[PDB]
Nucleic acid binder design. Structure first.
Lengths: 404, 265
DNA sequence: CCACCTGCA
């Protein structure tokens, strides 16, 4: 993972909003350096004029040595695919979406755009006049990865084009695609609601809501009146999306816990771990401390939320070295983070930290067993899904463009 | 003083709940006596007021849309559509069979519409939001609805710690960007479809009507404030508000910055 | 495929 200065993250952010967000880091900084002296005249042709302008004004304030409150933006490149690649240990899927580095023949690490890669592969094999629009394909890809079957049937028909689309996905992301296949067959036809707990204790409840259509006559012409009602259904197409979105939800909560932390709390937990804390105990802490530690054991995902429940008695049920290791992996100075589900914003002098923390979380998901842990609660019995490459997480730690 | 201002802001929000505030325009503020009139034509009072309100909101509405909002008043979907025929024939609003829609006749004043446009959506808080300790209450001092978005309540653990951590980030408005957007966004917004674009143009014009007034009122006691945050049932986190929000529209994101500025190096 | 509450001729 290469690092950048705070001013460089400003450069990248302004380039992004111009925007060259699919270019490599150095091409982005080179574009900036080239146009630094003319930025305000470029506002009318930037893709995001207002954010570009906010960024340019921040850069000027930084030149003058003025303090700034402006936060730069780093986006997940295909959040969903990243999470599914990590859950399944799918090295091929990982290379589509910057979970691990991809190098061209030159050997440069490239900022990959999964939708473009699969679109090219599809024209390359479909050949001979392929009647398919690039943006309609991205819609088909991203809705498919979240479990949609209706949207690919609309972009690709139900014939040979659909066949080529599914064949392409199965070579480019075999385990991701197999898992999506599997989620379809995981519904319970008797269930009114699905429930699972995330490793940081968030309880997910999905009520099963089905269409009830009352038909009505108004001037002797018919009108169908459809209202969502709680019920059951034979199949269900929702599980892949809801499970995957619950995981990006978790990544948001945990990234913010690790970045925007209370320094006085951190030092208390450090003393507590080293036997130096004044005695303090509350019986109410025990249940939650046990619950969260258990999720770590079953999943590999240790949440910094546990700091809230560690005291003189409760530290006894955890491994103090794991608690200290987590704290040591956090940024040396805390910072605020604004999040738009899979967009992340912070002051640019924390750019390096936010990317290190995102990498750590993806690597944790890749290394561990969160998928089995969640699938077991969804289907009502212990299942185990294996990693397709159990070492993928090692490469995840060092990946370059997970956030770009 | 800011505590007082916060109480003023919540008072404005509570007085401008969309549907209860509209009903007032048809009940205690109408010259028309809808109570007397709805009795006359035999239409249940609460149903009729509600139908009038929905038409003043929607302006135009197909039949399934209008019965949907009103379905809970009758044991049958059919009863709702009948009541709607009875009201359209008595000139409460018109139905045009050639476009299959109801068209409004009686709409609320522009002055009341301007207040609803300013205050019906939650605003940032100008004091630290209340610490959340149960799954009710969203940070304000006077709301105690379920913190989870839509009808998805549980009293199980939903990581209040995350909401409490986001809610205390102090934010402020960058007036330099805010003035640039107002002066220049309409002639910068080049056609990005062609029905979706003419839709984003309207969305900005509505926003531009009230944003500066709201931003000015908001920061009356100082340029520093806090957004409240709510989880959906999946655990995605949403910051709450229309005029000031770092989620949502690009002209909205641009104006927000951290209140604790820093010398970058 | 999921969500959310935007706008209301």
């Amino acid at each position: 993972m290469q690092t950048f200065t705070a001013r460089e993250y400003l450069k990248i952010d302004i380039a992004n909003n111009y925007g060259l967000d699919k270019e490599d880091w150095d091409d982005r900084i080179a574009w900036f350096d080239k146009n630094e002296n003319n930025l305000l005249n470029l506002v009318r042709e930037a893709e995001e004029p207002a954010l570009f302008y906010a960024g340019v004004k921040a850069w000027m304030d930084v030149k003058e040595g003025k303090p700034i409150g402006y936060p730069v933006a780093l986006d997940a490149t295909s959040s969903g695919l990243q999470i599914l690649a990590c859950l399944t240990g799918d090295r091929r899927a990982a290379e589509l979406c910057n979970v691990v580095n991809y190098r061209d023949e030159s050997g440069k690490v490239k900022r990959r755009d999964a939708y473009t890669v699969i679109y090219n592969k599809m024209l390359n094999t479909l050949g001979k006049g392929a009647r398919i629009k690039r943006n309609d394909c991205k819609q088909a890809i991203m809705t498919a990865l979240y479990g949609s079957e209706a949207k690919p049937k609309e972009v690709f028909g139900e014939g040979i084009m659909l066949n080529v689309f599914e064949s392409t996905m199965n070579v480019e992301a075999p385990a991701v695609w197999e898992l999506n296949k599997f989620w379809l067959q995981c519904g319970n036809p008797e269930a009114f609601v699905y429930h699972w707990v995330m490793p940081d204790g968030f309880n997910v409840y999905i009520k099963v809501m089905v269409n009830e259509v009352e038909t009505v006559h108004f001037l002797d012409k018919p009108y169908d009146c459809v209202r969502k009602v709680q019920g059951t259904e034979e199949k269900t197409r929702m599980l892949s999306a809801n499970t995957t979105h619950s995981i990006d939800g978790l990544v948001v909560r945990e990234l913010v816990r690790r970045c925007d932390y209370d320094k006085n709390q951190i030092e208390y937990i450090k003393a507590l771990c080293n036997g130096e804390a004044e005695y303090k105990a509350s019986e109410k802490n025990y249940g939650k401390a046990m619950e969260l530690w258990g999720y770590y054991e079953k999943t590999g995902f240790l949440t910094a939320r546990i700091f809230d429940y560690l005291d003189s008695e409760t530290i006894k049920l955890v491994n103090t070295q794991d608690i200290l290791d987590l704290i040591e992996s956090m940024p040396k100075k805390p910072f605020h983070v604004l999040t738009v589900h899979d967009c992340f914003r912070c002051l640019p002098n924390y750019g390096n930290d936010i990317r290190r923390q995102y990498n750590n979380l993806l690597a944790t998901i890749a290394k561990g067993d969160l998928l089995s842990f969640i699938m077991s609660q969804v289907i009502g019995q212990e299942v185990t899904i294996g990693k397709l490459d159990p070492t993928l997480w090692e490469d995840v730690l060092e990946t370059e463009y997970a956030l770009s | 003083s800011t505590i007082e201002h916060q109480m003023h802001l919540e008072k404005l929000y509570n007085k401008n709940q969309l549907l209860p505030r509209m009903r007032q325009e048809f009940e205690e503020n109408s010259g028309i006596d809808f109570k007397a009139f709805f009795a006359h034509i035999g239409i249940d009072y609460k149903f009729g007021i509600d139908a009038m309100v929905q038409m003043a909101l929607h302006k135009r509405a197909d039949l399934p849309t209008l019965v949907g909002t009103l379905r809970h008043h009758c044991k049958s979907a059919q009863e709702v559509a009948d009541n709607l025929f009875k009201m359209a024939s008595e000139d409460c609003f018109n139905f045009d069979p050639t476009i299959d829609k109801f068209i409004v006749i009686y709409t609320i004043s522009d002055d009341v519409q301007h207040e609803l446009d300013s205050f019906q959506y939650p605003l940032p808080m100008v004091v630290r939001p209340k610490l959340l300790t149960k799954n009710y209450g969203t940070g304000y001092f006077t709301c105690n609805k379920s913190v989870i978005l839509k009808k998805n309540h549980t009293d199980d653990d939903i990581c209040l710690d995350h909401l409490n951590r986001m809610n205390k980030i102090p934010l402020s408005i960058n007036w330099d960007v805010a003035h640039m957007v107002k002066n220049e966004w309409a002639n910068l917004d080049k056609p990005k479809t062609r029905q979706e674009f003419e839709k984003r143009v309207r969305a900005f014009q509505k926003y531009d009507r009230t944003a500066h007034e709201v931003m000015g009122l908001l920061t009356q006691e100082g340029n520093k404030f806090y957004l409240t945050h709510r989880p959906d049932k999946r655990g995605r986190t949403y910051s709450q508000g229309y005029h000031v929000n770092y989620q949502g529209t690009s002209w909205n994101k641009a104006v927000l910055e951290f209140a604790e500025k820093e010398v970058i190096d």
